[PDB]
């Protein structure tokens, strides 16, 4: 069957991840040859194609002379991987074709979901007819994380200058991997409105194209520096339940839209 898979677990915005397209080549006798075979994939506009990592015909790993790659940036983000005449010679009747390529998601954009589907288009050597087989659709979800720094007492007082790191964690008491780099940044500071937004993070409840198995996967914000005149909170680690359903909630805080999770973190004035 014609199948698409995505390997994206824990890959945030601007982290490389991969798609794989698998399809059966047609069958043909010794008196014929495969005259055309290509993969096509309309990449979501939020993706930046990086490179093809592998093209295989059965167990044969193809080389760059065996296929051509277009430039998705100049073809409306459509990727086309076409077997050359040398590449078509390496294809055996009924071979399982495979294409793996790498992308980066540039931003969350207007939906947490980012879908992908592909087509395999070839000439059937038995009839010389063009055949087009579409894959299933796979989905990758990312959301924005907005942090709003406030004074624990004085309601409505937002605080500039608070500094934070981000970690993977099982809980706020047990930090995992980090400080994480997200789109070249590994430390964020609250601005004049007491906020910053991390655009963006991989959701925890869905990964590699399917629902995640029940697990205690979370993100944690570590406040490393409090605003001037404020004591560093204890605890200074805030855990975030960064799921599709939690992100989708809206109008609970300023800037709380369906693609952003808003986390309000309190600080007590130095000397209480
Ligand atoms: Ca929201």
Residue numbers in the entry: 184 to 455
Which text from the study accompanies this structure?
This was achieved by partial trypsin digestion of the full-length selenomethionine-labelled form of SpaD (SeMet SpaD). Mass spectrometry confirmed the mass of the resulting product to be 30 456.00 Da, corresponding to residues 180–455.
SpaD, the subject of this report, is the major pilin protein that forms the polymeric backbone, or shaft, of one of the three types of pilus expressed by the human pathogen C. diphtheriae. As in some of the other Gram-positive major pilins, these three domains comprise a single CnaA-type domain flanked by two CnaB-type domains. Two crystal structures, of the full-length three-domain protein at 2.5 Å resolution and of a two-domain (D2-D3) construct at 1.87 Å resolution, show that each of the three Ig-like domains contains a single Lys–Asn isopeptide-bond cross-link, assumed to give mechanical stability as in other such pili.
